[PDB]
RNA sequence: GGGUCCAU
RNA sequence: CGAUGGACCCA
């Protein structure tokens, strides 16, 4: 308390400089009211210039247009909140007119007449505002598009109206074209990227003209892309700008486009390890019924809401208790989640998307500077987003003398609150220091508490999610005999007690009914507790009167609505969303609870375009009702993909596209493309010839041709693709060929598993003198396994892993394969497995019923090569339902060892290392799962596993040959665990060969049969695999080639050399579009055709029906039509700002389903779920509907991006 | 429920 | 009258 207080406000509310920066500029001016101003003048630039240490990342970009002089300014600050201020507008708006009138295309000239004022702000504000770049465009007719204030473009043209340069300014604002004409490139960038990326596949072998032609035709792209001309138009992506710009009386002279903060690095702004790094430096001197209240700190980027957020974590572990970068701390009764609102629109992305909103805000200002000019933007990020209540912590008060000064700061930050209809007068304000709290000063520590216990009394208890009215997202309807109508869904809020009246409201005239009951897969509880996955039973209502989407709420709770007001964010390009902006006519589907729904929208007053990244407010009207109320999140999806999220603000009042086009493809599709000869065999022969390689002369050669393993990769890439392309072909005419070769083989497996099941139960050679590498690895192996696995299979596991999928069983068949048919029909069951089946029967009230009980499985024939079929077993159903328990847990466990069976990727990623480092090897085994004898399986597994494993397996089988066998192998492929087992047996077996050879076990990675282990192991792993039964396939195990292959990918020294096969005789136009696409993928290098093969492609393209030669698709979208450029595609009907292309699809007729089976499969699955960008939590899994494939094809219109 | 690739 | 798992594509 030094000089005066009252007439210091006068010093503040004159310049607007920090408070103490005022009482102390009077603490050096004897009390001179007008001197005070000057001393702060020439003392503010020491501020602003030791301010340059704060990066200027955010800001605004300005544009002005006079007759035909335009200028695009790009002054910027360092915060959303400044860049939208009242004051930051004044400056960078007036500086924009100093470039207009006086045309100042020079940047230094204006960063000079203003540097006086460029501190009359920073002093008042507190962010490094550096006026960045200026420059202007002289045009004869030019226009500008202004996108928020974030991205600005300037396009001067000629002969074009406003309705042109607007658009072509909007194209420039949504397609960052760094050039104006395809022929604008300097032979630097062009002989950079053309004599750099010439060796690229010139080293790949590909000879001169090829790499020459590819590279070149690639730069034809590397240019058209970045250039206004060959750049698909943005408001009509069919024609490029250069073909729109020509169709009119116009031509772009040039364009300038600035984006608020490009080039500027801006290094990440974490929080936890930011706060924790503050908290763990001043650390140096039963009850889950606790609510979770989300709070965020919001304030000025330097009043240390980072410190004040540390004081609430320290002082709160020093006393009481103890998404995406939020810091939790605990309180005697509640549980908090603290954010830091660091950017206005950077936050609305969060509350909207649903990430983490705020149940209560906390405004950190420092009493040293008072409220800030951009404080209001903070408080206006308040009103504008919902945050219920706002708490105000006044930081750094010791640094203030006179107390009447403080009661003047409040004075202000109460009167800003109440310009934003927040309760200003009745809002709480704590005065205290953050840094001192850390230090340890308890006269201050009680303030960080005085605040904490304000969060304990001003932000009220959030309404328990199980306490609000009833509501439950109906996701599937069933008509069971004796239950009538039942819906199943995860009850979202409230309780439904059996007997109560629920009202089914949503899509049609809302209906009434009454709760007959509620059941899970096991219990039958008389109520539904929100958060549970139950089915709820209804009386007196037909099942064609409900649909997915509707909810089942207590009556009056929620009403159907069609039009409303919202705020939605649009998934940026890199977040897997759209990548072309859209405009006035967006027409998507809106995913609500369990169903899409189409709907049109209207942008607000003045916005005309919208783009990836934007988060626009918009009014939406749907094609028909949903049950909706304020605070209901919804995704925005376009055929499959999620491209935007968003919530509902207020719920309003409310009450080309050709066909005999689609018609023409339907028919062409069903054409049987016809030609003489083995088509395929021609495509192959012609393809070989295209690469100076001699074709097959008989189809007899097609698969008796062995590659050469030495040659330039190109000389080999082509060659492997020769030895493999026609290797799986079925329609192979001549050839004394059969599936009975397949059995013969299958029939050896046994003889082998005898030979080895027998002498593997005889670990007594003769003596004790000598020792065997085999007998040893089993001993290591066995132990290792037991530590990974256990005594026996867990039941908290055997439970969370036993499911019912796949097609056929000894009692079902492809026709009735889908799970609900397994729950409907009485499934088989092996004798030994009977005890489990009942265990289940005792676990549920549903009729787990076992049909015929037997020890047999059916051994059959799925096709494999051109010279042999595969030998399978259709298990008895109920065995399978359990075989999947231990197949499943064997998975989860095989994870510790490093093996991930859910990802053929880690295992083919390495296949590639191998081929380059020549250290890893890849090993193939022959009849993989067929040689695992019980012997080797017994002395290797725990005896509790080895039973639960004997129990569930099929011990006998019946062949088509009429006869039987008594499996010598522990398990046939077909078996439910046979995979995760061979994985584990193989893996362990190799890991042991690792230890005995002193090699880092962890270098062994296995996938069923595909083992990859350190190359030294391969002779031992081979001598072992010998001894223990398996037979190690020389011709397809590599430990030295330039070549490895693993999990479908092959490789020749870093280069991919994975071929493709033309498995069956090609007759359908679908069947062609495949080979043709597979071809395309195998010789494209990111769009550019290797020419050699582009030859044989085009030639065969011509075999296809006219319309279909021209109907093309982006890659990664199937084979319902030739992969090509989707813009060219003519039957590409654009609709509602979302492209739609037509793809062929195998035709289907709806079929009857079993209402129990599915109802049981749905509840049972819901039980399964319970013992097992960031907004895909608005996406469930869909109902059960069945259909048999017909012989026909059908044209399906699907959604689409621009690449 | 239908695909393509893929390990058995 | 086509087993079991991946991984993605439609639905
Ligand atoms: Ca293999
Ligand atoms: Ca094999």
Three-state SS for A367-413 is CCCCCCCCHHHHHHHHHCCCCCEEEEEEECCCCCCCHHHHHHHHHHH
For residue A580, report the distance from its CA to the centre of ligand 1, in Å. 43
What are all long-range contacts of A275-282, with beta carbons under 8 Å and residues at least 24 apart? A275/A306, A275/A309, A275/A310, A275/A313, A275/A327, A276/A327, A278/A306, A278/A307, A278/A310, A278/A438, A279/A310, A279/A313, A279/A314, A279/A438, A282/A310, A282/A314, A282/A438, A282/A439, A282/A440
Q: Which ligand is nearest to the CA of A1031?
A: 2
Positions on chain B within 7 A of a protein C-beta: 1-8
Nucleotide nearest to A1113 (CA to C1'): C9
Are the C-beta atoms of A136 and A238 separated by less than 8 Å? Answer: no
Q: Spot the catalytic one: A306, A314, A562, A978.
A: A306
Continuous segment of H or E residues that includes residue A46: helix A45-49
Burial of A787 per CB tally in 10 Å (0-12, 13-18, 19+): exposed
Q: What is the CATH number that goes with domain A465-558?
A: 2.40.30.10
Q: Take residue A986 and report the two structure tokens written for it.
A: 């193989």
- Give me the CA A1190–C1' B4 separation in Å, rounded: 19
Whether A492 contacts A1180, CB under 8 Å = no
- Between strands A551-553 and A1055-1056, the pairing is unpaired
Residue A601: CB atoms within 10 A of its CB come to: 23
Q: What does the CA dihedral A776, A779, A784, A785 come to, rounded to 10 degrees?
A: 120
| A451, A432 contact by CB (below 8 A) | yes
- The closest alpha carbon to A643, from A611, A668, A608, A687, belongs to A611
A304 carries a ligand binding annotation: yes
Residue given tokens 């192979």 in the structure block:
A732
How far CA A448 is from CA of A319, A454, A1164, in Å, comes to: 11, 10, 50
Tell whether residue A396 is among the known ligand binding residues.
yes
State, as a whole number of angstroms, the distance between the CA of A1182 and the C1' of C8.
Answer: 18
Q: Which ligand is nearest to the CA of A1012?
A: 1
* Alpha carbon distance A586, A584 (integer Å): 6
* Domain map (residue ranges) of chain A: 1-287+653-789+867-1143, 288-464, 465-558, 559-652, 790-866+1144-1203
Helix (H) / strand (E) element for A71: namely strand A69-76
Give the 3-state secondary structure of residue A480. Answer: strand
Give me the CA A880–C1' C4 separation in Å, rounded. 9
Helices (H), A1028-1138: 1069-1083, 1091-1101, 1106-1109
Contact criterion met (CB below 8 Å) for A1122 and A1111:
yes
Instruction: Among the bound ligands, name the one nearest to the CA of residue A911.
Output: 1
Task: Give the number of other Cβ atoms within 10 Å of residue A619's Cβ.
Answer: 17
C-alpha closest to that of A374 among A136, A82, A579, A144: A82
Helices A877-893 and A834-841: crossing angle in degrees, nearest 10, is 90
DSSP A582-630: EETT---EEE-SS---BEEEE--TT--EE-TT---EEEEEEEEEEE--S
> Phi/psi of residue A1027, each to 5°?
-35, -40
A885 DSSP assignment: H
Pair A956, A855: CB distance under 8 Å: yes
A167, A338, A344, A784: the active-site residue? A344
Instruction: Kindly tell me the burial class for residue A50, based on how many C-beta atoms sit within 10 Å of its own C-beta (0-12, 13-18, 19 or more).
Output: exposed
> What is the distance between the alpha carbons of residues A371 and A570, in angstroms, rounded to a whole number?
33
Nearest to A519 by CA among A502, A508, A533, A501: A533
Of the CA atoms within 13 Å of residue A1022, those in its CB half-sphere come to: 16
User: Under a CB-based contact definition with an 8 Å cutoff, are residues A936 and A781 in contact?
Assistant: no
Q: Is A430 annotated as a binding residue?
A: no
Q: Judge whether A563 counts as a catalytic residue.
A: no
Distance CA A669, CA A1145 (A): 9
Q: Which nt is closest to the CA of A874, judged by C1'? A: C3
Distance from CA(A1146) to C1'(B3), angstroms, rounded = 8
What are the residues whose beta carbons fall under 8 Å from the beta carbon of A231, sequence distance 6 or more?
A171, A175, A177, A224, A225, A240, A241, A242
SS3 call for A548 = coil
Method: X-ray
A503-505 vs A551-553, strand pairing mode: antiparallel
- Domain A559-652 -> CATH class: mainly beta
CA dihedral A988, A993, A996, A1001 (to 10 degrees): -60
Please check whether residue A141 is in contact with residue A251, taking contact to mean a CB–CB distance below 8 angstroms.
no
- Measured CA to C1', the nucleotide nearest A1036 is B7
Pairing of strands A292-299, A360-366: parallel
- Yes or no: domain A288-464 corresponds to CATH 3.40.50.300: yes
- Which listed ligand is nearest to A864 at the C-alpha? 2
Q: Which sign, positive or negative, has the C-alpha torsion A925, A927, A928, A934?
A: negative
Q: Do the beta carbons of residue A850 and residue A837 sit within 8 Å?
A: yes
The answer to whether A288-464 and A559-652 have equal CATH topology is no
Query: Diameter of chain A by CA atoms?
Result: 115
Residue A66 is a catalytic residue:
no
Distance between CA atoms of residues A737 and A741, nearest Å: 8
Residues within 5 Å of ion ligand 1, judged at the Cβ atom: A 924, 1009-1010
A167 a catalytic residue: no
- Enter the DSSP assignment of A1002: G
Which phi and psi angles does A1200 have, rounded to 5°?
A: -165, 140
Exposed, middle or buried, A816 (CB in 10 Å: 0-12/13-18/19+)? buried
Chain A window 889-928, residues with Cβ within 7 A of nucleic strand C = 901-905
* Residue A688: Cβ within 10 Å count: 19
Identify which of A1039, A832, A773, A999 has the alpha carbon closest to the alpha carbon of residue A919: A1039
Known binding residue A300? Answer is yes
- CB neighbourhood size of A113 (10 A): 12
Alpha carbon separation from A902 to A236, A730, A1006 (Å, rounded)? 42, 30, 12
Task: List phi, psi (to 5°) of A1157.
Answer: -35, -55
| A421: number of Cβ within 10 Å | 9
Q: Please indicate if the annotation marks A299 as binding a ligand.
A: yes
**One-letter-per-residue 3-state SS of A325-357:** CCEEEECCCCEEEEEEECCCHHHHHHHHHCCCC
**Residues engaging strand B (CB under 7 angstroms):** A 807, 814, 817-818, 870, 904, 924-925, 927-930, 973, 978-979, 982, 1007-1010, 1047-1048, 1058, 1060-1061, 1063, 1074, 1078, 1118-1119, 1145-1146, 1148, 1185-1187, 1189
Nucleotide nearest the Cα atom of A1077 (by C1'): B4
Per the annotation, the verdict on A1090 as an active-site residue is no
Helices A662-670 and A1069-1083 cross at an angle (nearest 10°) of 90
Dihedral angle sign, alpha carbons of residues A1028, A1031, A1034, A1036: negative
- Strands A641-648 and A956-958 come out as unpaired
Q: Half-sphere exposure of A291 toward its Cβ, with a 13 Å CA cutoff?
A: 17
Q: How far is CA A881 from the centre of its chain?
A: 31
Query: Is A1019 known to sit in a ligand binding site?
Result: no
Is A961 buried (19+), middle (13-18) or exposed (0-12) by CB count in 10 A? exposed
Nearest to A292 by CA among A323, A325, A324: A323
Task: Give the bases of strand C that a protein CB approaches within 7 Å.
Answer: 1-11
């Amino acid at each position: 308390a030094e000089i005066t207080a009252s007439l210091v406000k006068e010093l503040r509310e004159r310049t607007g400089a920090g408070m103490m920066d005022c009482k102390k500029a009077l603490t050096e001016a004897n009390g001179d009211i007008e001197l005070a101003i000057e001393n702060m003048r020439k003392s503010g630039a020491i501020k602003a210039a030791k301010k340059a240490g704060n990066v200027a990342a955010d800001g605004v970009i300005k544009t002005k247009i006079d007759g035909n002089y335009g200028i695009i300014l790009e002054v910027n600050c360092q915060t959303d909140f400044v860049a939208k201020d009242a004051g930051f507008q004044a400056f960078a708006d007036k500086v924009l007119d100093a470039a207009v009138a006086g045309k100042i295309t020079d940047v230094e000239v204006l960063k000079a007449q203003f540097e006086e004022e460029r501190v009359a702000l920073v002093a008042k504000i507190g962010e490094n505002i550096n006026i960045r770049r200026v420059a202007a465009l002289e045009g004869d007719v030019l226009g500008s598009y202004q996108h928020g204030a974030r991205i600005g473009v300037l396009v001067a043209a000629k002969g074009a109206d406003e309705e042109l340069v607007k658009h072509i300014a909007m194209h420039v604002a949504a397609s960052k074209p760094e050039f104006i004409k395809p022929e604008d490139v300097s032979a630097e960038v062009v002989e950079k990227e053309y004599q750099v990326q010439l060796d690229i596949a010139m080293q790949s072998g590909k000879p001169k003209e090829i790499a020459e032609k590819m590279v070149e035709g690639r730069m034809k792209k590397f240019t058209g892309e970045v250039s206004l001309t060959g750049q698909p138009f943005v408001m009509e992506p069919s024609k490029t700008v250069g073909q729109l710009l020509k169709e009119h009386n116009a031509e772009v002279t040039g364009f300038i486009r600035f984006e608020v903060g490009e080039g500027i690095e801006k290094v990440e702004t974490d929080f936890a390890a930011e706060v924790a790094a503050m908290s763990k430096q001043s650390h140096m001197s039963f009850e889950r019924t606790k609510p979770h209240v989300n709070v965020g700190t919001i304030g000025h980027v330097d009043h240390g809401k980072t410190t004040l957020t540390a004081a609430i974590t320290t002082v709160l572990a020093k006393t009481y208790g103890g998404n995406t970068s939020h810091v939790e701390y605990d309180t005697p009764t509640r549980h908090y989640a603290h954010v830091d609102c660091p950017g206005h629109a950077d936050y609305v992305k969060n509350m909207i998307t649903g990430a983490a909103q705020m149940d209560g805000a906390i405004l950190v200002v420092a009493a040293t500077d008072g409220p800030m000019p951009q404080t209001r933007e903070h408080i206006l990020l308040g009103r504008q987003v919902g945050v219920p209540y706002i708490i105000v912590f006044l930081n750094k008060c010791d640094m203030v003398d006179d107390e009447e000064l403080l009661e003047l700061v409040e004075m202000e930050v109460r009167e800003l609150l109440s310009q934003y209809d927040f309760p200003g007068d009745d809002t709480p304000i704590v005065r205290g220091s953050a840094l001192k709290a850390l230090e340890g000063d308890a006269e201050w520590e009680a303030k960080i508490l005085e605040l904490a216990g304000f969060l304990d009394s001003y932000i009220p208890e959030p309404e328990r999610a199980i306490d609000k009215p009833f509501l439950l997202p109906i996701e599937d309807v069933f008509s069971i005999s004796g239950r009538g109508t039942v819906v199943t869904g995860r009850v979202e809020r409230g309780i439904i007690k059996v007997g109560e009246e629920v009202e089914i409201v949503g899509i049609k005239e809302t209906q009434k009914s009454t709760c007959t009951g509620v059941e899970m897969f096991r219990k039958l509880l008389d109520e539904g507790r929100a958060g549970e996955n139950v089915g709820v039973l209804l009386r007196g209502i037909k099942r064609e009167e409900i649909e997915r989407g509707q909810v089942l709420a207590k009556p009056g709770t929620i009403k159907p609505h069609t039009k409303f007001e919202s705020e939605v964010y649009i998934l940026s390009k890199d977040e897997g969303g759209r990548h072309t902006p859209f405009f006035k006519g967006y027409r998507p589907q809106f995913y609500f609870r369990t169903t899409d729904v189409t709907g049109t929208i209207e942008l607000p007053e003045g916005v005309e375009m919208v783009m990836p990244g934007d988060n626009i407010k918009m009014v939406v009207t749907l094609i028909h009702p949903i049950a909706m109320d304020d605070g209901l999140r919804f995704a925005i999806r376009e055929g499959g993909r999620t491209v935007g999220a968003g919530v509902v603000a207020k719920v309003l009042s409310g009450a080309s596209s050709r066909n005999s086009l689609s018609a023409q493809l339907r028919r062409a599709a069903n054409t049987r493309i016809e030609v003489e000869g083995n088509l395929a065999l021609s495509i192959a022969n012609d393809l070989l010839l295209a690469y100076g390689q001699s074709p097959f002369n008989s189809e007899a050669e097609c698969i008796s041709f062995s590659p050469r393993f030495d040659g330039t990769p190109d000389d080999f890439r082509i060659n492997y693709l020769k030895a493999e392309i026609m290797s799986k072909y079925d329609d192979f005419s001549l050839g004394i060929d059969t599936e009975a070769v397949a059995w013969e083989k299958f029939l050896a497996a046994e003889a082998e598993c005898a030979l080895t099941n027998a002498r593997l139960y005889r670990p007594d050679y003769s003596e004790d003198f000598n020792f065997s590498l085999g007998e040893s690895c089993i001993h290591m192996a066995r132990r290792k396994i037991a530590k990974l696995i256990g005594d026996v299979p867990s039941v908290e596991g055997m439970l969370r892993h036993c499911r019912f999928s796949g097609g056929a069983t000894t009692t079902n068949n492809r026709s009735y394969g889908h799970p609900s048919f397994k729950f409907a029909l009485p499934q088989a069951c092996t004798p030994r497995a009977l005890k489990y089946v009942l265990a289940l029967r005792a676990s549920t009230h549903f009729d787990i019923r076992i049909s015929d009980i037997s020890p047999f499985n059916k051994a059959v024939t799925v096709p494999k090569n051109s010279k042999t079929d595969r030998c399978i077993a259709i298990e008895p159903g109920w065995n399978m339902f359990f075989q999947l328990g231990i197949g499943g847990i064997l998975r989860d466990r095989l994870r510790c060892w490093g093996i991930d069976l859910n990802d053929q990727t880690i295992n083919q990623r390495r296949a590639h290392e191998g081929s380059v480092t020549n250290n890893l090897a890849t090993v193939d085994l022959s009849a993989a799962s067929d040689s695992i004898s019980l012997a080797l399986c017994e002395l290797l597994l725990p005896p509790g596993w080895f039973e639960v494993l004997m129990d569930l397996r099929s011990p006998k089988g019946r062949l088509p040959d009429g006869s039987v066998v008594t499996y010598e192998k522990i398990s046939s492929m077909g078996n439910g665990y046979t995979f995760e087992l061979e994985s584990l047996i193989f893996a362990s077996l190799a890991r042991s060969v690792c230890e005995i050879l002193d090699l880092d076990s962890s270098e062994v990675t296995v996938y069923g049969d595909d083992i990859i282990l350190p190359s030294c192991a391969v002779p031992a792993l081979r001598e072992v695999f010998k001894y223990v039964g398996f037979t190690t396939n020389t011709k397809k195990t590599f430990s030295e080639g330039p070549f490895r292959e693993s999990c479908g990918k092959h490789y020749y020294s870093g280069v991919d050399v994975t071929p493709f096969y033309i498995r069956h005789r090609i007759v359908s136009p679908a069947d062609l579009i495949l080979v043709l696409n597979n071809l395309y993928r195998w010789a494209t290098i990111d769009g550019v055709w290797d020419p050699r093969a582009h030859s044989v492609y085009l030639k065969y393209r011509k075999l296809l029906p006219k319309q279909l030669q021209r109907n093309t698709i982006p890659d990664g979208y199937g084979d319902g039509a030739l992969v090509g450029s989707v813009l060219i595609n003519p039957f590409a009907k654009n609709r509602g700002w979302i492209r739609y292309v037509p793809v062929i699809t195998d035709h289907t007729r709806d079929r009857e389903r079993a209402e129990l089976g599915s109802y049981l499969y749905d509840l049972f699955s819901r039980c399964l779920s319970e013992s097992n960008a960031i907004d895909q939590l608005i996406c469930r899994s869909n109902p059960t509907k069945i259909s048999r494939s017909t012989g026909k094809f059908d044209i399906q219109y699907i959604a689409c991006s621009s690449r």
